[PDB]
Structure formats: structure tokens, C-alpha cells
Design a binder for these strands. Structure first.
Ligand SMILES: [Mg+2]
Ligand SMILES: [Mg+2]
Ligand SMILES: [Mg+2]
Ligand SMILES: [Mg+2]
Ligand SMILES: [Mg+2]
Ligand SMILES: [Mg+2]
Ligand SMILES: [Mg+2]
Ligand SMILES: [Mg+2]
Ligand SMILES: [Mg+2]
Ligand SMILES: [Mg+2]
Ligand SMILES: [Mg+2]
Ligand SMILES: [Mg+2]
Ligand SMILES: [Mg+2]
Ligand SMILES: [Mg+2]
Ligand SMILES: [Mg+2]
Ligand SMILES: [Mg+2]
Ligand SMILES: [Mg+2]
Ligand SMILES: [Mg+2]
Ligand SMILES: [Mg+2]
Ligand SMILES: [Mg+2]
Ligand SMILES: [Mg+2]
Ligand SMILES: [Mg+2]
Ligand SMILES: [Mg+2]
Ligand SMILES: [Mg+2]
Ligand SMILES: [Mg+2]
Ligand SMILES: [Mg+2]
Ligand SMILES: [Mg+2]
Ligand SMILES: [Mg+2]
Ligand SMILES: [Mg+2]
Ligand SMILES: [Mg+2]
Ligand SMILES: [Mg+2]
Ligand SMILES: [Mg+2]
Lengths: 205, 80, 129, 122, 156
RNA sequence: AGGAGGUCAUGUUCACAUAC
RNA sequence: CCCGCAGAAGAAGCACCGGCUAACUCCGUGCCAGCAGCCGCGGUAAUACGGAGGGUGCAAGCGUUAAUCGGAAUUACUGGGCGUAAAGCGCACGCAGGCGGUUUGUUAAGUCAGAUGUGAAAUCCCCGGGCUCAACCUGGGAACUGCAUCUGAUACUGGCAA
RNA sequence: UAGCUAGUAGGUGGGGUAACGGCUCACCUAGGCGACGAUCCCUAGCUGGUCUGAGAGGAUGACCAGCCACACUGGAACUGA
């Protein structure tokens, strides 16, 4: 299932950062974040409108670590929900449990957050949840288990997320390592660099 | 009150029996044009009092023949 | 043979608006009179007036706004060859409620919005956008 | 045209003939090869196209193409054929599924092997 | 701050006594994103000259479109020579669902939610012309209420 | 300005490039 | 289902890279071998054949074939045309059939409104619940555009009278 | 595929069926269906539904459910609600 190849190759193809690495070190220091991967990565050819739509879809997919047939299901659910389909889609993607546990600081990257979720270390509403793609609910409590609360990487990732920005729609008590998911975030609260209408007008082909 | 159908006689050549026409106005399914379909019925006439071209009110009864299951209620507009 | 006087009236209005005539005339009838009354109430025409007794003539004064005619598009819906009847739940909107649609209901001839407010549909006559 | 005319003569759909008739709406058919040989393509092309005259199980006798580099087919070699034509070759409208009952996989392929029935190289 | 984008670059011939004389023709559409849009054809012997000429001819010859928050006011049917274009005011957040030329025209005009379909022919020149004509022949509640001599709240 | 009179059969086949 | 043990330890492939269509260079070959869904490519520098490196798309799947719908407004009721692109009978008369100038009544057949019965459950949709999530199961609704009956309205069509 | 149909269409009476009925029989009448497609030929189980489709529509009738038909082929009855 999950993608297991080189990470920064994806960011190089997308041109920009995708937060695939911890962030302790600058991405340009880590690799050439400008040149596209491959032998012919130097020159840049024009990409058509189909190219840019596919590139936005793959950008979002590779940000959140979601494969295609799961992403299409997310799109269908977003289109079925009342309201704005793009905002619904981004709400679902942000509501993924692994994304939540990465946002609140219990993990360096989304991959590490996914491993923490899958190795029975996280727990919503006092029950151990093993599903990476679990859909959290408003006003729910996400904590880490008492057994795994002693790991070092949890502390390290907490410190890493401290100096990043703080998502305002989920309150995190790092003292006892728990969090409360306040409400579904808004497109204002999400990243403006994520062009959005392209995905919907691509799937509506 | 009983369910009745008004129609026009087509032929009364056979004995103790008449034939009616029940032309109705049913909208076409696909196109919407109001066609004028016609259904022929065999109706049981007693005393053979009916004649072609006469408006007839008929009612549905128990079968009385291989093809006859309607009886006459009252003739009207006997005009020739 | 003249088999649709309502369509003829709509055609007269459309051609007059295209040809920049100030007024149009036609042989009147109590249904064209009602349609013209609806049009005047909705402001698509300036004023209507009948004249004569034996063979009455209806006369309409078309309305212009800034040299361009007010009546952009107007057409007949329920042609004699194919009648149209819509219930209360399908009274169609013209230009998303900007234009009107003349509907003959069991309570006279009225605009589609008025018919929908009254809660009864009927025959359609024309889309006036 | 008019609704009144359509009522009398409704729209008579355009029934479509299948491009692959001798398959009887089946993905593939087994056939015994009667004659393997080569032909020449139409005017723009120039080559020696390898074809075979297959007798299917429904009595249909058709002409099939043999894709890839070389083969091991002669008379009485039971093969499996699938649809698809070869254009610059007037009669052929079927491809032998290479890597099947008797069609040995074309030797020494490295990419697009699945289309030619070649096992994974070690 | 006029956004601008080319649609199609074509190659044409002239067949002079010496031989063929190839030349290129562009087609570009510019717009502000808030109603003002325009298109320019442009035609030269090289692609850069063609696109520059089309952009210059497209900055001039711009029309004004009465818009409703990045959406059309009412369904419209534009027609030019071989192309008939149908446009419809879709709800918010649905994106620009449109064909080839219409996509560029709307994306630079400022429309953001619209359903579209290009019947007839699909030649880019005629499609662009028909889309701009159709958008031009669109009314807003204000202008239609002024024309009919009634209040907007009466028209609703 | 109006209207009139008075030689020549045929031609292997396929190749022909520029697209910011 | 929960707990405990050891150890990254037992677990990634398939198609494509000329345009359509996201993704390019070298070598082999020389109208041959071959490829191909359409346009085509190959005759000595091939981004189109075969191999390699690189990349793109899907992922325990990936491709090819068959079949239906869509795009196809290309059977056009919504939603086409007929001077020359396919298409106006050689021309008329006319029975069925389709359509019907204007006014007043009356009927209420079409038409519209309301009500009752029915339209099985399941399926589709909406709001919820339960399986760790999902697929799946389930509660309550909404729909099931229909049909029949009853009571109304008279604008329009129809019937009858003038 | 243009005309098809003599128990055929209808009436009186006898018989028969749990029941109405040419269901059957005798007699009488000459009707009946058909361009709104009768008769004949080819194909096919039907519906709720499934797929596709913006929709109208098009295709389809596997699994689940309702109905019909059949039980090697062609007949026939007994028992029994
Ligand atoms: Mg899977
Ligand atoms: Mg019977
Ligand atoms: Mg076309
Ligand atoms: Mg010669
Ligand atoms: Mg010679
Ligand atoms: Mg490309
Ligand atoms: Mg290939
Ligand atoms: Mg070479
Ligand atoms: Mg290759
Ligand atoms: Mg169609
Ligand atoms: Mg056409
Ligand atoms: Mg000709
Ligand atoms: Mg012609
Ligand atoms: Mg003629
Ligand atoms: Mg005549
Ligand atoms: Mg009249
Ligand atoms: Mg009449
Ligand atoms: Mg009524
Ligand atoms: Mg139900
Ligand atoms: Mg739940
Ligand atoms: Mg339910
Ligand atoms: Mg009346
Ligand atoms: Mg009347
Ligand atoms: Mg008897
Ligand atoms: Mg008896
Ligand atoms: Mg059968
Ligand atoms: Mg469609
Ligand atoms: Mg069927
Ligand atoms: Mg079965
Ligand atoms: Mg057997
Ligand atoms: Mg038997
Ligand atoms: Mg018994």
C-alpha cells in the first residue's frame, strides 16, 4: 500500500516543500530542492492544463500520504456532503487521525505519525485505534498510551512541533501528551498554497 | 355510485349484444402529444334496443360470453 | 391558414421590436387582451388599447429603454400541435426568475411567480425573457 | 421531424455490427492452426507479417497475427486467439495470445513482458 | 495587473510561386478577473511575434461583463458561426467545468463556478467568439429592473 | 452615341524540414 | 479480542514515456526485424522497433481482450436538418388522420388543486446507531415521478347550443 | 408478414365446474378481429431493481425478493383442502 521510495524526490518533482522530512535541517541543505529529479531534471518544459491539474492532485496526495483509490473515495464523499466540495475534501483530509496526531505534535512527519498510530500507541476516547485513516470527530480526545508514553521520539517530535506553527482548532497539552480536537478546520485555517479547485475540476472530468 | 364508461356504438348486428368504442385522450409517454386511442368492447344489450351511432353508458359485470363482460346501463342520444 | 393567434401576436411584437416600430396592431381577442394586460403589468409594454366594435383592433405601444428594445426574447411554448401543462411544482423559471412565463391557470391568466404563490399551475402560453 | 410524424415512425436505432464477429462475444477462443505463413502489408508499409489460418471451435476459420519476434507454431498447434486487428493487413482481425496453450513466450524480453508471456527474469 | 493566457498557436501556409510560405497565428485572451475580458487573434511569421501581436490586440477590444461573485447571473446560450455554447450558473465551489477555449475565457474573466458545454463545432476561434458574445448578452437584476421600470425587490 | 458583316497520344513509384 | 516474547527482522510488482496523454537520453537495427487505439514510425544519427539508465501512473495488484452506457446534439421529446455538403415526392385532387377566425352560454372530458386507498420488503437518497475505521449491517424518514376514487375551479383545449 | 377466423362471433336449452363462461353439446342467427397493425415469422421468462447518464433516456434482468413455467421426451388421470 503505502509509498516506500525516496521522499525528497517527491518534493523535488513538485518543486516546493512537502514536509516529508523532519525539518530539523533546511531542505535545500538536504538536497537540491529546485531541480526536478532524474537525468533530464535540469530543463523545464511547459506543462498543459491537464499537467497542472494532475500535478496539484499528486501534490495533495503526496502531502497526506493517501493513495489514489482512497483519494477518489474521499472526493466522492466530499461531493456528496452538502456545501463546498473542495472545503469538504480538505476537511476530511485534515480529519484523518494520522494527520491529527501529526499536527498536535506526536510525530516528526506524517509517516512517523502513521507508524505511531499503526503500532498501537495512540488512543481516541480511551480506546486503542489501530487505523491510520480513522476519521476523528469534533470534541474528541486523542492521547498516547501509558506504555508508549515513555518513548524518546515522542519528546523529540513534541519539541520539533513546538517551534513550528500551532493549529488553533486542536488544543494540545504536551505535559500529559493529550489533545482535544475542537472543530473541523476552515480553508482560512489551512494552507493557502494548496490550490484547491483543480482537484475537483479534475475528478469531474 | 358505480364505475361507468360512456362510449359510442360501432355495430349492433349480433343478437342481444352491441359493440362500443371508448375513445380516450391519453398523453403519449415520450413526446407529450395527446393522442386519441380507442378501445373496442363487447357489451350485453337486452331487448336489442340500441342502434349504431348512439351514446351508451356501460358498466362492468360478470362474464356473460367468451368475449362479453359489460352490460348496458342507459342509452342516451339515440339520434340517427 | 391562421391557426395560432397567440403565436401571431408574439410574432408581431417580436418583429415590431426588431423593426423599431413605436406601436403594433392586431385583430383583438379576449385572450390576447389578457396577455397584453399581463405584459403591461410586468412592464414589457408601455400601454395597450382596443378600438372598434365589429372587428376590434388591439394596439400595443412597444417600450424601448436606451435604443435597445426591452423584450429581448419571446416565444410560444404550448403550440397547438403540442400543448404543454405543468403542475404547481414545475412552473418553470425563465432566466432564473428574471424573465416571466405567462401561465393560464383556473383563476385567469397570470405570471408564473403569481401562479406559484397562489399554489396552482396550468397551461403555459409563452416565455418572455 | 414533427412529433406527429415521430409518433407514427419512431426513431429506429442504429444497430452496430461488431468488429470481432468470430468470437461470439467471448474474450478469447481456442483454435487449431491450419497454415502458418507470411504476407506483405499494404502500400505504406513493407515487411513480412507472420500470420496463421486458425480454425476456431465454432467452425469459423479466421486469419490471426503472430506478434513478437519469432514463434514455434505449425499445423495442429492449438493456440488461443483474442480480438484486435493489425490494420495494414487486410484480412487479419485477431492476435494470438502469446504465452498460452502452445504459443511459447517470445525469447529474451525485458520490458512489456506481460503482453508477450515471459516469466520474470531472475 | 491584467491576467493573460494564450489558447492555441496554429501554422498556416500561403503557397507562393516559389513555394509554401509558412506563418504562425496565435490566439490569446486577457482579462482583469472582475468582468473585463477580451480576446485577440494576432498573426505573424514567428511564434513570439504572433503572441506579442495578439496580446497587444487583446488589451484593446475588451468588453464588460455583469457578474455575480464569480458566477453567471442566469443561463445563457451564445452562438457564433459553427459553435453553440451553453453556460449555466453553478453553485459555489464547483470550479470551472468547461471545454477548451471556454476554460481559458472564463478563468481569465473571473468566473469561478459555471457549468458549460460546447455543442456544434469546437473550433477555438468560434468558441471564444461565441463565449464572449454569450457573456456579453447577459443581464443583471439591476439592469433588467431598470429596463422594465420596476424595483429589484419586485423582480427578486 | 444605336446595330451588325467576315494539328499536339502518353509520363515507374515513394520520398518535402523548421512549432518560443 | 487482550496480553507476553524475539527480532527490521517474513512481505513490491505491472504498464507507459511521438501527439492525443503525466513522463527522455544512449546503444543495437537499417522499409529488415518489428510496433500500432487513431495519426503513423522503420530505407544509417529512430525521444514511435529491441536493450540499458532515468522518469511518470497505478499498487497486491497491474495490463490486454470481450460487453454496455457516456463523450455521440452521431435516431436530435428535452436536443438536428433538407438552395449547393445526405435529404422537398414530377404535379395536382382527395378519403381516413393532424390542426381550427371571433362572441355568449352550458358541461366538466382533457387540465389544475385538495383528500383517501394503494404504489411489498430490500435497493437509491437524508439524518442517526453498531462492528477499532471502512466496506458491511441497521433505526426513522423522504422518494417510489404511477393508478383508481371522491370533492372543488372554468383561464385554455374538447363536447353541445345559439 | 394483409387480410385472418365454422365452436369461429353471438342467442335459446341440456350437461359440466367450487365458481361465471363455447367449458362442452344440439339448434338458431352471420357474425368476430384487423392500419390504434389482425394473422404469420424471428427472438425472449416478467417485475422490484443493476450499470451508465446532469437529466430525459439507453443497456440489462447474475446474486437478494415477488410472480410464472418445467422436471429424460409426449400424453393421462387417481389420491387429496
Ligand atoms: Mg487496496
Ligand atoms: Mg371467459
Ligand atoms: Mg460536428
Ligand atoms: Mg499509358
Ligand atoms: Mg501505351
Ligand atoms: Mg507531456
Ligand atoms: Mg509498445
Ligand atoms: Mg541509432
Ligand atoms: Mg523502446
Ligand atoms: Mg444520444
Ligand atoms: Mg447534422
Ligand atoms: Mg453534388
Ligand atoms: Mg446533394
Ligand atoms: Mg417541386
Ligand atoms: Mg393539395
Ligand atoms: Mg379557436
Ligand atoms: Mg375536430
Ligand atoms: Mg375533469
Ligand atoms: Mg419499497
Ligand atoms: Mg460510526
Ligand atoms: Mg432503511
Ligand atoms: Mg371551455
Ligand atoms: Mg368552448
Ligand atoms: Mg349454457
Ligand atoms: Mg345448467
Ligand atoms: Mg429462451
Ligand atoms: Mg448526455
Ligand atoms: Mg426487457
Ligand atoms: Mg443461475
Ligand atoms: Mg439431463
Ligand atoms: Mg411428464
Ligand atoms: Mg379429489
Amino acid at each position: 500500500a503505502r509509498y516506500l521510495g525516496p521522499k525528497l524526490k517527491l518534493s523535488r518533482r513538485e518543486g516546493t516543500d512537502l514536509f516529508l522530512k523532519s525539518g530539523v535541517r533546511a531542505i535545500d541543505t538536504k538536497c537540491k530542492i529546485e531541480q526536478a529529479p532524474g537525468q533530464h531534471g535540469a530543463r523545464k518544459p511547459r506543462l498543459s492544463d491537464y499537467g497542472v491539474q494532475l500535478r496539484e492532485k499528486q501534490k495533495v496526495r503526496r502531502i497526506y500520504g493517501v493513495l489514489e483509490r482512497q483519494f477518489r473515495n474521499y472526493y466522492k464523499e466530499a461531493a456528496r456532503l452538502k456545501g463546498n466540495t473542495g472545503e469538504n475534501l480538505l476537511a476530511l483530509l485534515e480529519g484523518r487521525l494520522d494527520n491529527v496526531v501529526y499536527r498536535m505534535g506526536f510525530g516528526a512527519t506524517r509517516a512517523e505519525a502513521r507508524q505511531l498510530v499503526s503500532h498501537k500507541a495512540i488512543m481516541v476516547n480511551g480506546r486503542v485505534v489501530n487505523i491510520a485513516s480513522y476519521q476523528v470527530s469534533p470534541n474528541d480526545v486523542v492521547s498516547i498510551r501509558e506504555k508508549a508514553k515513555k518513548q524518546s521520539r515522542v519528546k523529540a517530535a513534541l519539541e520539533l512541533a513546538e517551534q513550528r506553527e500551532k493549529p488553533t482548532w486542536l488544543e494540545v497539552d504536551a505535559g500529559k501528551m493529550e489533545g482535544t480536537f475542537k472543530r473541523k478546520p476552515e480553508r482560512s485555517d489551512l494552507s493557502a498554497d494548496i490550490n484547491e479547485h483543480l482537484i475537483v475540476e479534475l475528478y469531474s472530468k | 355510485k358505480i364505475r361507468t364508461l360512456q362510449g359510442r356504438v360501432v355495430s349492433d348486428k349480433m343478437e342481444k349484444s352491441i359493440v362500443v368504442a371508448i375513445e380516450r385522450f391519453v398523453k403519449h409517454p415520450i413526446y407529450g402529444k395527446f393522442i386519441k386511442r380507442t378501445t373496442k368492447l363487447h357489451v350485453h344489450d337486452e331487448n336489442n334496443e340500441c342502434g349504431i351511432g348512439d351514446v351508451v353508458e356501460i358498466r362492468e359485470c360478470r362474464p356473460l360470453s367468451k368475449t362479453k363482460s359489460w352490460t348496458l346501463v342507459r342509452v342516451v342520444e339515440k339520434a340517427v | 391558414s391562421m391557426q395560432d393567434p397567440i403565436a401571431d401576436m408574439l410574432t408581431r411584437i417580436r418583429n415590431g421590436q426588431a423593426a423599431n416600430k413605436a406601436a403594433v396592431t392586431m385583430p383583438s381577442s379576449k385572450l390576447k387582451v389578457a396577455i397584453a394586460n399581463v405584459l403591461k403589468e410586468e412592464g414589457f409594454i408601455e400601454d395597450f388599447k382596443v378600438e372598434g366594435d365589429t372587428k376590434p383592433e388591439l394596439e400595443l405601444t412597444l417600450k424601448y429603454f436606451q435604443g435597445k428594445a426591452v423584450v429581448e426574447s419571446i416565444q410560444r411554448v404550448s403550440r397547438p400541435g403540442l400543448r404543454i401543462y405543468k403542475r404547481k411544482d414545475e412552473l418553470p423559471k425563465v432566466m432564473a426568475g428574471l424573465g416571466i412565463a405567462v401561465v393560464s391557470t383556473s383563476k385567469g391568466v397570470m405570471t408564473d411567480r403569481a401562479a406559484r404563490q397562489a399554489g396552482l399551475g396550468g397551461e403555459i402560453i409563452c416565455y418572455v425573457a | 421531424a414533427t412529433v406527429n410524424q415521430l409518433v407514427r415512425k419512431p426513431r429506429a436505432r442504429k444497430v452496430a455490427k461488431s468488429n470481432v464477429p468470430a468470437l461470439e462475444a467471448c474474450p478469447q477462443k481456442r483454435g487449431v492452426c491450419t497454415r502458418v505463413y507470411t504476407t506483405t502489408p499494404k502500400k505504406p508499409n513493407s515487411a513480412l507479417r507472420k500470420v496463421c489460418r486458425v480454425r476456431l471451435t465454432n467452425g469459423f476459420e479466421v486469419t490471426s497475427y503472430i506478434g513478437g519476434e519469432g514463434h514455434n507454431l505449425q499445423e495442429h498447434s492449438v493456440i488461443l486467439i483474442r480480438g484486435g486487428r493489425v490494420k495494414d493487413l487486410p484480412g487479419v482481425r485477431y492476435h494470438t495470445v502469446r504465452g498460452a496453450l502452445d504459443c511459447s513466450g517470445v525469447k529474451d524480453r525485458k520490458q512489456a513482458r506481460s503482453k508477450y508471456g515471459v516469466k520474470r527474469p531472475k | 495587473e491584467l491576467q493573460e493566457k494564450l489558447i492555441a498557436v496554429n501554422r498556416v501556409s500561403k503557397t507562393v510561386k516559389g513555394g509554401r510560405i509558412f506563418s504562425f497565428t496565435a490566439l490569446t485572451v486577457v482579462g482583469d478577473g472582475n468582468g473585463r475580458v477580451g480576446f485577440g487573434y494576432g498573426k505573424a511569421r514567428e511564434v513570439p511575434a504572433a503572441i506579442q501581436k495578439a496580446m497587444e490586440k487583446a488589451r484593446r477590444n475588451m468588453i464588460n461583463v455583469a457578474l455575480n461573485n464569480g458566477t453567471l447571473q442566469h443561463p445563457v446560450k451564445g452562438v457564433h458561426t459553427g459553435s453553440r455554447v451553453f453556460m449555466q450558473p453553478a453553485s459555489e465551489g464547483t470550479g470551472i467545468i468547461a471545454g477548451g477555449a471556454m476554460r481559458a475565457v472564463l478563468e481569465v474573466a473571473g468566473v469561478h463556478n459555471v457549468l458549460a458545454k460546447a455543442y456544434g463545432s469546437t473550433n477555438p476561434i468560434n468558441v471564444v467568439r461565441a463565449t464572449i458574445d454569450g457573456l456579453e448578452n447577459m443581464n443583471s437584476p439591476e439592469m433588467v429592473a431598470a429596463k422594465r421600470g420596476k424595483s429589484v425587490e419586485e423582480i427578486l
